[PDB]
Structures are given as C-alpha cells and as structure tokens.
Design a protein around this ligand. Structure first.
Ligand SMILES: [Mg+2]
Ligand SMILES: [Mg+2]
Ligand SMILES: [Mg+2]
Ligand SMILES: [Mg+2]
Ligand SMILES: [Mg+2]
Ligand SMILES: [Mg+2]
Ligand SMILES: [Mg+2]
Ligand SMILES: [Mg+2]
Ligand SMILES: [Mg+2]
Ligand SMILES: [Mg+2]
Ligand SMILES: [Mg+2]
Ligand SMILES: [Mg+2]
Ligand SMILES: [Mg+2]
Lengths: 63, 86, 190, 97, 62, 139, 143, 139
RNA sequence: GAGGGACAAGUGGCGUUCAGCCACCCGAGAUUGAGCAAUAACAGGUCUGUGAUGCCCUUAGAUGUCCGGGGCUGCACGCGCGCUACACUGACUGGCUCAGCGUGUGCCUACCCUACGCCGGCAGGCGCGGGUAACCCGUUGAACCCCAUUCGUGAUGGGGAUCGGGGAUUGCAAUUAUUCCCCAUGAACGAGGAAUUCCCAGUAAGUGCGGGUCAUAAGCUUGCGUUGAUUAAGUCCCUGCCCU
C-alpha cells in the first residue's frame, strides 16, 4: 500500500522541480535536504516525501 | 420434574466392571509369576490387565520395586514407568 | 560441538523413508533442539509453519478442549513420558516411529466441493502434504484423547499406544481407522 | 529545600522547569536535576448515552498528571527570590524546607 | 493400481466453491515431460512432490 | 503386607451400610456424618487411615461408634457439631442417623404450629431462600 | 565447601527440616490444632500428621528469605484459592491463629528476632541450625 | 571490570552481571541447576550446553530477575545470558571470537540475541477479550 | 523529556515511460492497536439526566411533598446474555514459585486503604503505627502452573443446588433476599437434537487481580496481566455491502 497521497506526490514533484540540484541518489542525505528546502510538519511525512523523491531521482537520472 | 434428555447414547465402557480392593492369594501368585515377565509396568497396565484397583496396584508395585525385581525409570505426578532387567 | 539431543537421545539418523514429506517434517539437524517448547512465531508467514519441529507440533495439537488449553509444560511432560514408553517398548527410537506414524496416518486424498455451479458431487481431490502432516497430528491426538477419556489409562499410555499402533498400521488404531474411512469415501466419490 | 512542580501539560511543565534552571544556575546554587515522577492517569469510562439503546459504546477519558522534583539546598532567603517568577497558570508549586 | 509421485511446477490458480482448491501441475518424474492438472486443497508451493492415487484424472478449467 | 482379611460390609447404627473402599470416606455413608466429622472421629480413634473398611477390628468399630454417638465426653468442641445448642432442650449434641429425619419433621412440625412463612413456603411447593423463582426450579 | 540454603534442592530441604524439628522437640503446639483444624478455607484436614512441623519449617524458610514479615504477611504468603462453588473462586487468606501460633512457637524456641516496625526475622541461632541442616542435606544429595 | 546486560522477554527482565572469574551462576541467589520449572530445567541450559566449557569457565555471570511470569523468566534469563556473552566479548575478548560465536548462536536461533516485540493487546470494550465479542441475539 | 530510527529505501522478478505487487538481505520493527471520523437521513431512543423546553393535565382531601409498611424477588410455564460443572490432561492435601493496570481519610457537604502485635477454630475483635502517596500497605510473596501424597472409572471424594441448626459483621431496620463462615443435607448432570454466535498471533481459550456501583458487594461490566494452540493468508456458494 505505497499508493502515496496526492499531497505527498504533489509536494515531491514541487520539491524536485524547484531544487533538482541539491538532491542526490542517497536517501538519508535527501531526507535531510528536504528539511532544509521545505517545511514538513511531521517525520512520517518527511520519510514518505524523501522516499518518493529518491524513487523519482532514480527515474530522472535514468531518463 | 419430567425427565427429558436430548441425546441417547447408553451402553458405557463396560457396564460397571467389578474390581477387587484386595488381592487374593491366587491373584498374588499370578502377580509373582508373571508381573516380572511383562515388559512395561504402569499402574494402568497392571490394573486393566489383571483387574486391580489402582491404589492396590501402586501398593503392589511399591512392594516389588522394594524387592528390586523391577527397575524404575522415572516417577512423576501421575505416571509410574518401570522395566525388568532381561 | 555436541549433538543436538532431546533428552537422553541421539536425535539423529531418523530417515523419512519416502519423499513427498521431506522439508515439511523438521526432524533434520538444523531444526532439532532440546525441548519442544520454543518461542512460537509461526503465524507470521504461510509456509514458515514448516520450520516448527514435529514434536512441538505434537505438543501443540495435544493441548486442546478448554480444560487443557495452554499448559505446554503439561503437554511436554506428556511427550517426555510417551517417548520413555516407546523406548522401553521394542526400542527403535521413538522419533523414528513418530515420523513413521505421521507417514502412515494422514489421508492422501479427500472429498470436497468443486465447481460447474450445479449439483456438487463431493469430488475426490488430492491433498497438500503440509495438510497431511497437520491432519496426521490432529488424528493422532484426537484418537489418544478420546481413548484416554474415562479409563484407568493415561494420556501418556494412550498417546504412546496411538503412536506405536499408527507406525504399525494394523487396523487397531484410530488414525488408521480415519485413514481408511477417508480413502473409502474418496473411492466412493471417485 | 525542594520544589515540586505538578503541572497540567508537558510543554508548560518543561518551559517552567527550563526557566527555573536558567534562573538557578547563574548563582552558586548546587542543583539536583529535574527528577521525573511517574505519570498518574485518572480514567473515567462512561456509557455515552442517556438511555440504553443501541450498541454498547463507551467513552475513555484520561488526564495525565506530570511531576518534577528539584532539590535546592540553600538558605531560604534565596528561595524567596526564586519564588518570584511570572509563572504559567497551569503549573502548581510546592516548596519544602 | 500403481501409485505415482509428481512435483509441482506452476500454480494455475485457486478455484472451488470456497476458493479452497488450487489447480496445479505436478509434472511427472517417472518419464518425460508429462503434466496433468490436479486439484489440491491446503497450502502448496513450487517443488512440492505430490502423492497421486491416479495419474489418469484431468479436471481442467480456464 | 496384609494379603487378605475376610470382611465386606458392616452394619453400623442399625440402618446404614459401610462398604470396603476406605474407612474415612466410607463412614460418609451414614446420614448426619460427612466430610470432616469422620476425619475428626478417625483421628480421635487413632486409626491408620491407609487401612480399608474390610481390614479393621470390630472392637475399634465399637470404639468409633462410641465417638460417633458421644463426642463431648472426649473432646470435639461445640461449634463443630450438627445440632447446635439452642434447641428444644439446649443440648450441644450431634444428631444420629435415624434421628436426623425425625429432627427435620420436628422442625417442619413446629414451624407449622407458628405458621412462620418459612415453614409455610416449605410446605408449599416453593423455595424459601430462592429469591428468584421465574426460572429457578422449573418442572 | 560453602553450602547455603538456596544451593540445595528445596523440597528435599524441608523434608529434613521437618525431621530435625521433630528431633529437638522445639514446638509448642497447644490443644486445638492437635485436635483438628482446617487450613485457609479447606474441606479436609491434611494427611501428614506432623504438618505443624511442616508449617514451622516453611515459616522458618520464608522468614529467612523475606525477613520482617508478620502474621497477615505470612497469611498472604500461604495463598488462598477458595472455590466458593457455583460462584467462582477468589484469593482468600490463610488462618491467622496458626500464623501467629508458629511465630509464638519459634519465638519461645529462640529462632525469632524482632524487626521492630514489622515482625519476625532470623536469629544467629536459627542461622546456624538451618545452615548445618542445609549442609548435611547437600552432603546427602551428593551421597 | 563488569558488564550488565538485560533479558527482555515479554514483561520479564533479567539484569545479567558478568564479572571476570572462575564461573558462577547466581539466579536470584540460586544456582543454575535449580530453576522453578522442572520441565524447562533444560531450556535455560541451552546457552551453557551450547557454548561449553572454557567460556563460562572464564566468565562469572549472576542474574537478577524482577520478571512477570514463570515461563517468561526462563526466556528472559536465557536471552540475558546470550547477550551477556556478547557484551563481555565486546569489552574483553576481540571481535574475531565475538562475531564467530555470535554467528553460531544466531544460526542456531535468532531469539537468543534478538528481543521479540510482542506485548499484549488492550482489551477492547465491546467484547470480553481483545478480539472476541459477546453472543448476538436474533429471533 | 528533547531527539533519532522505517521510507518499499537495496537486490532480483513481475510491471506500458509508469502506478505498484511478489521474494529476500540488513533491522528492534518490513507495520501493531485504538481514537477522531464525511453528505443526507431514521417520522430509531431518551419529556424517567437537567432550573433544556412548547402544549395539555393536576394543584391543598395534590399526580407537589414528607413519614410508616409493602413492592418491583411473588411461579403450571417459554425465551436471551452468562457462571459452575459433567472428572484421571482430573479432584484432595502439603510443599515450591514469579505480575501488571491502578485504588486509598476529615473530600463544595460527607467520606477510607491497611502494616504490626495479642485473643478467637473461621468469619472477626482489640490496642498500636503509617499513608493525602515512586515515601505506607507494597521488592502488591495472586491464581494458573510446578513437585510430592491420597483417591482409581465408580453419580466416585466429580458435581454443591436444595436446606436443618448455629456464629460473626454492616446498618435505623435483614424477616417474604443482605453478606461472610462452620457442621449437616448430597439432586439434576454421562460433553448435549433442530439451529446459532465469536475468532487470525501474544490472537481464541484456561486463570486470577484492579476499578465502576458500594455499607454490606459480584456470577455483571470495564481495564489489567498470567499460561498460551489448532487452521487460514483465500473465495463470492450462503448472509450482507460497494462500483459500472
Ligand atoms: Mg468451553
Ligand atoms: Mg458516518
Ligand atoms: Mg424537571
Ligand atoms: Mg425488576
Ligand atoms: Mg432457560
Ligand atoms: Mg448483549
Ligand atoms: Mg468438591
Ligand atoms: Mg457423592
Ligand atoms: Mg444462539
Ligand atoms: Mg474452571
Ligand atoms: Mg468491585
Ligand atoms: Mg468497590
Ligand atoms: Mg450491572
């Protein structure tokens, strides 16, 4: 059930579209980069955003 | 009140089998001549095979174990496990 | 460095005579341990039930019917008594004849409802070998329990009696009774 | 001389305790730590309905009682100055000599 | 009436009135690649050698 | 080891029958005497409790019956008995076998004189302490 | 070597401790208990006739281990399951007169020191007694 | 020179204090061979009979338990032994022995080193258990 | 208390650039249990929760109000939720042995929890002491379980209702109900027809404790633990729901 919510995918696409540059292919680094470039109210939401951000990075780096 | 019961399964185990509280001398000589020759001695086996009440069975077993003919393997709550040498 | 043994036992060279029950009986060396009572975590995944040792499975199916529910200390005591009975009776290590009773116990074909969405003929189908091990242990403990109900005999004596008369399937045991009864119904619905 | 802070919520408890430690440690006061007494929980369970119709449906109310002890062995003249703090209305203070 | 043994290759699905049965192929070990479709109740993986009491059944479904 | 002693059943208190199962649990068959009063009588008679009823001495039987018919001569204080003090005589006594149903008939007879409703509902087909009788004791 | 009372099998220990109470005769068992007395809430008297020696052995053991107990404390040590019948069972307390009886017996026989806020505790006399008994039961265990 | 590790069974915790010395076992004042269940007076032996001679012969290990239940204490003491060896090897005898003996213990059983997070479920309001409910009533 | 730690992130396979699923390593855990909970309704229930209330009715010989008894309990019956059981995997008797929630007094109007010692067989009593509580009850020495004894297939000692006599204790009062204890009495009941409920892992079930009611007070209910399985991990036949 990783069917992730509209707000999560929305904020994730906004994050990658604004700041592609800081984000890398390392999940634990990208997690802390999300708290620097955004305001996330909760840690579960941080983890969900960062996971789908890394899964988008493994597509954008691909094609 | 009226006696109504919803199931009918009569004819129990064997219809109040009689059992001797005290061993006669013929039964005691039968003990002394073939209770060595059994392979495993429990009070249940001795009771159901020789028509003995279980307390009398435990009395006879604790007798002949004190003779040392029988060999104890273990004892616990409700099971008494025996053998004979050879 | 020691050999992993149950009590006074070897717990070794127990050979399942056929295949179709290998890897569902955990009698092997990587799943042989001292006591049957282990940390039960065997409902997590479907097929990880196979890694339980069959002696623990025999204890688990032995504790039933409310009055005896729980009390794994009591049922491990029962198994400890029963192996001590089978050791004195004919030798031939009780783990081996337990495996032989499991083989010559559970049914190999049954009857069930199949489709076509009409009148159900109770069609004869096969059986999973996991379900053979399960139904084997269930029929063994059921026969032992309702044999030891209301007699001078004990759970230990009736359980050892049921295991020995199931490893020697001479039509006196309740496991061979329900074995033959299920195969006759399957042949009649064949 | 000890001070018992028994409060209604955890955040105001932590804030008044941090203010007390910050107003304590600039002086030469040997301070024992904010020891955490265990949380008492007063529970009330209620039938939820004025008449007994429907599914049996129960409330489950809780309050959390929090408590911190701090020991300040001193002359009581300093403790009179320590007492004067604009304190949050959800916090209760005991002083014991 | 010989008894044959057969090991599972695939799982075609779960069928029955209750969904209890599993239509599967046990292949045949004795000769070349012969495989019939038989019903099994109870859990079954790949690599489960199955005991057959008749190798002449085939109750197929799509 | 006591091989065999020739006894099956005694005649005690002119009405009752003792078997051979034990001594302390076969004196139980006498009315008015149950679980613990026998274990009082047995331990005052100093009998080994392992022995059966079919292995015991008739002199010791008569001594037991003496303990049964009169406890207060030896010991066995007043609180333990069946017939408490305050009676149509005030005697701290133990009721007998045949005397028990007679004392019960005297109880019901003197409650019927008073017409206390305890004895009245006892004479009716009812329960005295049976607080609810919608479902209790049907048929 | 050193043998302490915890280092021995435990029901084996009380089996000899009740005997070495009977050897000395360190007991004041007055009248009613010798007559007949039930336990906490029980139906029969106990079978083993020296059960006051047995209770005294158990009391001596528990006062050696958990010191400072009293009458009601040892009353709750013994532990009551009272099957009331149709109405289900509960934890019922032991009898109080035997609980203070064994205390009065061991106090008169010089095996009870007083913890003054509480009650009974060990004496050095009873320490030597219980300890030599544990040593000889350990020797009987190995032998 | 000593390390204290814990048991963490379900609500049973064994403080295991391992000090250098000849080898002793204090379980609540009482040695190894005397535990409260006679049946599980082999299960707790599994770390000792699995490690062997020169390892307990090198470490003193004493155990203090304020646990929750009989069977829970056995697994708590068991896992406390198996973790006490791990931490005493991290302090005293190097990783080339520690990870190897830890691999032997884990390839035997994971629960000797890994605590299982399985506590109770809270008793739900509708039924008498945590999952079950009362009987409904139709007509 | 602050913070960290778990996201399908890593591998492989199935996948349309996908969405995602399956299997496995590592981890403590590959997700646990709840709470809250939409739009619109029922002619659902409460006027007996209210000084929340319309209208009607009664208001001095009262449908207001006290006060004394009685009663909702009264039994040829049928039905619902449950407790104890039907015994040997057990009862009896002794010994051994480990918990967790949480509760406790001079209170916004009437209120305790118990430690110790001594008397009594038990229920209980009398003096003394503590606790407005991580301080004392209370290292809550619980039951189940475990070891040993006796009982031996017998309506037996399983079963404990029925009921005779007595003794404490609350209370203003227990008798047509208190409650607790002792002795006595010792029934039906042999695992239950038609049918039906509940339940997937610390789960059902055995077992005891704490709270609510209260003075006396649990078989009820609500939380806590303690010992701890079997069989699934699937379908839409039966019951019922959601979308075309
Ligand atoms: Mg049941
Ligand atoms: Mg809604
Ligand atoms: Mg009003
Ligand atoms: Mg009513
Ligand atoms: Mg009815
Ligand atoms: Mg209901
Ligand atoms: Mg009884
Ligand atoms: Mg009877
Ligand atoms: Mg129903
Ligand atoms: Mg029960
Ligand atoms: Mg209550
Ligand atoms: Mg109350
Ligand atoms: Mg109620």
């Amino acid at each position: 059930g990783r069917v992730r919510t509209k707000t999560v995918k929305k904020a994730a696409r906004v994050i990658i579209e604004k700041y592609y540059t800081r984000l890398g292919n390392d999940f634990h680094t990208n997690k802390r980069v999300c708290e620097e470039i955004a305001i996330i109210p909760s840690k579960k939401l941080r983890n969900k955003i960062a996971g789908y951000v890394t899964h988008l990075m493994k597509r954008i780096q691909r094609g | 009140g009226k006696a109504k019961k919803k199931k009918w399964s009569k004819g129990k185990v064997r219809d109040k089998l009689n059992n001797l509280v005290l061993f006669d001398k013929a039964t005691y000589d039968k003990l002394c001549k073939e209770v060595p020759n059994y392979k495993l001695i429990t009070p249940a086996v001795v009771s159901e095979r020789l028509k003995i009440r279980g307390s009398l069975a435990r009395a006879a077993l604790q007798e002949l174990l004190s003779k040392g003919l029988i060999k104890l393997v273990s004892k616990h709550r409700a099971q008494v496990i025996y053998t004979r040498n050879t | 460095p020691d050999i992993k043994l149950f009590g006074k036992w070897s717990t070794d060279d127990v050979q399942i005579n056929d295949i179709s029950l290998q890897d569902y009986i955990a009698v092997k060396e990587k799943y042989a341990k001292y006591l049957p009572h282990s940390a039960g975590r065997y409902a997590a995944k479907r097929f990880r039930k196979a890694q339980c040792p069959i002696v623990e499975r025999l204890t688990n199916s032995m504790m039933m019917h409310g009055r005896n529910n729980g009390k794994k200390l009591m049922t491990v005591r029962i198994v400890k008594h029963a192996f001590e009975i089978i050791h004195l009776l004919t030798g031939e290590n009780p783990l081996q004849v337990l495996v032989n009773a499991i083989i010559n116990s559970g049914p190999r074909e049954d009857s069930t409802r199949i489709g076509r969405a009409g009148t159900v003929r109770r069609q004869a189908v096969d059986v999973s070998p996991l379900r053979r091990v399960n139904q084997a242990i269930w029929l063994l403990c059921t026969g032992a329990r309702e044999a030891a109900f209301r007699n001078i005999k004990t759970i230990a004596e009736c359980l050892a009696d049921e295991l020995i008369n199931a490893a020697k399937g001479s039509s006196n045991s309740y496991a061979i009774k329900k074995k033959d009864e299920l195969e006759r119904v399957a042949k009649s619905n064949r | 001389i000890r001070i018992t802070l028994t409060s209604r919520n955890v955040k105001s408890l932590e804030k008044v305790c941090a203010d007390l430690i910050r107003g304590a440690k600039e002086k030469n006061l040997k301070v024992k730590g904010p020891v955490r007494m265990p949380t008492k929980t007063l529970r009330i369970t209620t039938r939820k309905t004025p008449c007994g119709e429907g599914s049996k449906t129960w409330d489950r109310f809780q309050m959390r009682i929090h408590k911190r002890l701090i020991d300040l062995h001193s002359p009581s003249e300093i403790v009179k100055q320590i007492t004067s703090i604009s304190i949050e209305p959800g916090v209760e203070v005991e002083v014991t000599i | 009436q010989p008894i044959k043994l057969a090991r599972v290759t695939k799982v075609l699905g779960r069928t029955g009135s209750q969904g209890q049965c599993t239509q599967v192929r046990v292949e045949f070990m004795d000769d070349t690649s012969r495989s019939i479709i038989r019903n099994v109740k109870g859990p079954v993986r790949e690599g489960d050698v199955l005991t057959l009491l008749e190798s002449e059944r085939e109750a197929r479904r799509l | 080891v006591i091989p065999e002693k020739f006894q099956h059943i005694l005649r005690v208190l002119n009405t009752n029958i003792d078997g051979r199962r034990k001594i302390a649990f076969a004196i139980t068959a006498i009315k008015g005497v149950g679980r613990r009063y026998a274990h009082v009588v047995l331990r005052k008679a100093d009998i080994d409790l392992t022995k059966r009823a079919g292995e015991l001495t008739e002199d010791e039987v008569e001594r037991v019956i003496t303990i049964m018919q009169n406890p207060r001569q030896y010991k066995i204080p007043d609180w333990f008995l069946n017939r408490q003090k305050d009676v149509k005589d005030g005697k701290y006594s133990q009721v007998l076998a045949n005397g028990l149903d007679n004392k019960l008939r005297e109880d019901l007879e003197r409650l019927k004189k008073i017409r206390a409703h305890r004895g009245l509902r006892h004479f009716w087909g009812l329960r005295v302490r049976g607080q609810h009788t919608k479902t209790t004791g049907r048929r | 070597p050193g043998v302490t009372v915890k280092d021995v099998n435990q029901q084996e220990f009380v089996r000899a401790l009740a005997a070495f109470l009977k050897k000395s005769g360190k007991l004041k068992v007055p009248e009613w208990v010798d007559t007949v007395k039930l336990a906490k809430h029980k139906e029969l008297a106990p079978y083993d006739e020296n059960w006051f020696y047995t209770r005294a052995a158990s009391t001596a053991r528990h006062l050696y281990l958990r010191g400072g107990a009293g009458v009601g404390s040892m009353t709750k040590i013994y532990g009551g399951r009272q099957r009331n019948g149709v109405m289900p069972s509960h934890f019922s307390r032991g009898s109080k007169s035997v609980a203070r009886r064994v205390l009065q017996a061991l106090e008169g026989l010089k095996m009870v020191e007083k913890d003054q806020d509480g009650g009974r505790k060990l004496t050095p006399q009873g320490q030597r007694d219980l300890d030599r008994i544990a040593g000889q039961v350990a020797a009987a265990n190995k032998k | 020179q000593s390390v204290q590790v814990f048991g963490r069974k379900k609500t049973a915790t064994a403080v295991a204090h391992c000090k250098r010395g000849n080898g002793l076992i204090k379980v609540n004042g009482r040695p190894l061979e005397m535990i409260e269940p006679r049946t599980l007076q082999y299960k707790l032996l599994e770390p000792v009979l699995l490690l062997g001679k020169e390892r307990f012969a090198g470490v003193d290990i004493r155990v203090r338990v304020k646990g929750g239940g009989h069977v829970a204490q056995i697994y708590a003491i068991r896992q406390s032994i198996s973790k006490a060896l791990v931490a005493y090897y991290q302090k005293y005898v190097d990783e080339a022995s520690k990870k190897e003996i830890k691999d032997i213990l884990i390839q035997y059983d994971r629960t000797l080193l890994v605590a299982d997070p399985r506590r109770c479920e809270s008793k739900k309001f509708g039924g008498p258990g945590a999952r079950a409910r009362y009987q409904k009533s139709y007509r």
